[PDB]
Amino acid sequence: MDNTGKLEKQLVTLNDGLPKKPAKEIIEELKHHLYQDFQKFFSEEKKQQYQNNFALFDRDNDKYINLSELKELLTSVNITFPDDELEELYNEFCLTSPEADGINEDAVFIIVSKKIRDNDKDEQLTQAFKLVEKAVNDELAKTPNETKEQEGYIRVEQFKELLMTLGNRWSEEQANEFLKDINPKSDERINYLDVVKKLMKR
Amino acid sequence: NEFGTEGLMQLAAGLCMNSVLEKLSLNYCAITAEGSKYIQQILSFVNTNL
Amino acid sequence: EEEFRLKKEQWEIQERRKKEAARCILHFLMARKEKSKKKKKKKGKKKK
Amino acid sequence: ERQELEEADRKQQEELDQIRLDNAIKLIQIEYQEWKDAGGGKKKRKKGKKKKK
């Protein structure tokens, strides 16, 4: 009564669910699941092939490969990557092995185990957006007037309607932030190919 | 628990790369030297909150 | 060859007929309109 | 028949050019997607035990 309030601006304080166990394993889950990809997605043939190829690479049988030999192994498997980023990844993994003159096999291969999911994200996004293009064509089939100048435009609000379902559920704030960054020209639409170029370019 | 190498490997099946516990003790277990290779895989891991 | 050439000339004529059809196709949706608004997300991941 | 052979050769060149364009499209996307299944294992023995002399 008397409009005696009162709303509370619930700020979620960073004082909940703090991990308890400091410094031996507990992140072991993440890469383990990553391992299950090659513990799942890959046939054991490539595993054995890489085991033997590296053991050939491991001229000293130390399980490790230096910068030159790591680039050797990446090239032998047909890896085409810029020098810089591979260099920083190798440096990080060597920091993970401060007393070893290189990186161990598991961490060595994690270098592009990361790029595995990295490129899988782009592959899934491209497949989902090709399906989006097919859906747009299906919709335009029922719509005669839309001329060939519309070939490449379907409602951006629809871009957001679809994003959450194709490939991976996109956060509501994720879609809002992306749309705001792209900056549509107040026409309630953008060019899908230009967005594709931006997303494959960043 | 004198499970030895067999028991240590059975544990490592998921615990070698498990990421749950805080303190794990296997003292007076006569863990064979060879089986230490399994623990070798635990330490070479970069993910670490035990 | 003559039969197939007659058929393909008919093909060109019916292609121009279909082009006129398309001309009449760009003619159906000038402004409307009414906001098929809410939701069509669900796109079950089982794909083609 | 020889002129048709030249025509088929030109068609095959066109197809190979289209496949090369597809290759250019694919090159970036297929830049080693899937770097692979764990390797080197559990060497433990002190094997070196051979002749004394």
Side-chain angles (χ1 to χ4, degrees):
Chain A
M1 294 295 287
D2 279 277
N3 202 15
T4 59
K6 202 174 183 180
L7 285 170
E8 275 189 85
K9 310 158 184 178
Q10 262 203 324
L11 61 94
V12 188
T13 310
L14 285 72
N15 265 352
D16 276 333
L18 284 71
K20 300 182 177 178
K21 331 191 193 166
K24 190 180 173 194
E25 79 174 5
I26 281 186
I27 309 96
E28 292 269 340
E29 268 173 308
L30 312 178
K31 261 180 188 179
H32 190 288
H33 301 130
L34 180 149
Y35 274 105
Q36 286 265 337
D37 307 336
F38 181 72
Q39 297 185 359
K40 185 184 287 185
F41 298 114
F42 303 81
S43 184
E44 277 63 28
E45 59 91 16
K46 277 296 180 183
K47 173 190 169 185
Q48 73 89 32
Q49 182 187 15
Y50 275 75
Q51 301 193 108
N52 296 348
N53 279 354
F54 181 94
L56 297 165
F57 295 129
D58 190 6
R59 310 274 195 172
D60 68 328
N61 199 32
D62 78 331
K63 309 183 176 188
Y64 304 155
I65 53 172
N66 76 67
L67 180 65
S68 59
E69 273 155 332
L70 168 49
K71 192 170 187 169
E72 277 195 273
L73 197 160
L74 308 174
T75 309
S76 79
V77 296
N78 199 42
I79 297 187
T80 52
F81 273 67
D83 193 307
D84 51 358
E85 182 191 336
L86 295 183
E87 196 165 276
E88 291 88 6
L89 292 166
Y90 175 80
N91 287 316
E92 171 185 84
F93 277 123
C94 295
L95 182 63
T96 76
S97 300
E99 287 79 57
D101 203 32
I103 309 163
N104 64 335
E105 183 167 18
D106 294 304
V108 160
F109 287 81
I110 296 149
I111 287 177
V112 186
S113 296
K114 179 183 179 178
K115 202 68 156 197
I116 292 180
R117 295 282 70 76
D118 297 340
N119 287 137
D120 200 70
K121 283 161 195 151
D122 270 306
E123 181 175 275
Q124 57 94 24
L125 192 68
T126 304
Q127 172 60 86
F129 280 140
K130 281 176 183 173
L131 290 181
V132 171
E133 163 182 47
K134 190 270 184 183
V136 189
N137 291 342
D138 293 353
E139 193 155 272
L140 284 156
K142 299 173 186 169
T143 67
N145 175 16
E146 303 301 328
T147 182
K148 70 158 295 283
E149 302 180 286
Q150 194 73 31
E151 184 80 28
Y153 298 79
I154 191 166
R155 304 316 213 288
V156 162
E157 280 74 352
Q158 184 175 1
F159 186 80
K160 182 178 176 177
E161 204 286 300
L162 275 61
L163 282 183
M164 283 74 74
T165 304
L166 274 185
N168 289 318
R169 282 190 165 171
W170 270 40
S171 314
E172 301 312 326
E173 286 183 352
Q174 180 178 5
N176 286 329
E177 301 298 328
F178 182 76
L179 164 78
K180 294 167 191 170
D181 307 332
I182 305 285
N183 199 32
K185 52 211 201 302
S186 176
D187 58 350
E188 215 179 80
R189 183 63 189 95
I190 298 169
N191 210 17
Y192 83 93
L193 293 162
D194 80 14
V195 176
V196 177
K197 274 180 183 171
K198 274 74 176 176
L199 279 168
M200 190 95 98
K201 270 187 171 187
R202 181 183 180 273
Chain B
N1 293 278
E2 285 71 2
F3 54 89
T5 302
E6 174 52 29
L8 189 153
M9 183 278 288
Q10 298 309 346
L11 277 296
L15 277 176
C16 83
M17 185 180 288
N18 186 275
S19 89
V20 181
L21 201 71
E22 293 105 8
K23 308 189 176 142
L24 176 60
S25 182
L26 301 173
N27 70 19
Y28 290 95
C29 289
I31 291 301
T32 62
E34 193 276 334
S36 278
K37 83 209 177 185
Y38 299 110
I39 296 89
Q40 179 176 5
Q41 282 178 356
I42 301 169
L43 293 177
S44 306
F45 211 87
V46 66
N47 295 336
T48 181
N49 280 340
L50 178 68
Chain C
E1 189 171 359
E2 280 188 351
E3 282 183 352
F4 282 52
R5 204 183 66 183
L6 281 172
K7 259 182 183 179
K8 214 175 181 182
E9 207 183 359
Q10 262 193 348
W11 161 70
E12 261 180 355
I13 302 171
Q14 286 175 352
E15 181 190 6
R16 267 175 213 186
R17 279 173 182 175
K18 179 249 291 186
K19 279 172 186 177
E20 304 299 332
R23 258 176 190 187
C24 293
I25 277 179
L26 281 66
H27 177 37
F28 193 55
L29 296 174
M30 194 282 257
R32 272 198 57 187
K33 185 177 283 186
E34 291 184 354
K35 286 180 186 175
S36 80
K37 260 201 176 185
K38 261 188 179 179
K39 278 162 191 170
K40 281 178 183 176
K41 275 181 192 177
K42 283 197 179 178
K43 265 206 174 192
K45 265 180 185 176
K46 277 158 152 207
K47 272 172 181 184
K48 61 184 184 181
Chain D
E1 293 172 349
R2 307 321 208 287
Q3 43 203 270
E4 290 184 354
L5 266 293
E6 273 177 6
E7 268 179 1
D9 276 346
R10 182 168 64 201
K11 276 180 185 178
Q12 286 159 355
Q13 281 183 351
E14 285 171 6
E15 171 158 48
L16 285 171
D17 275 343
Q18 181 143 346
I19 288 177
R20 266 185 180 179
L21 291 173
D22 263 347
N23 268 344
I25 289 180
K26 268 175 188 173
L27 182 62
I28 293 176
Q29 313 164 40
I30 311 182
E31 281 183 356
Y32 212 72
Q33 165 75 50
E34 69 282 22
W35 189 25
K36 283 81 174 175
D37 289 330
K42 293 75 177 176
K43 53 176 63 66
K44 141 73 177 172
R45 176 169 273 175
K46 273 182 184 177
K47 259 188 176 181
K49 245 192 175 182
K50 276 175 186 173
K51 289 166 190 174
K52 275 176 184 178
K53 293 181 331 203

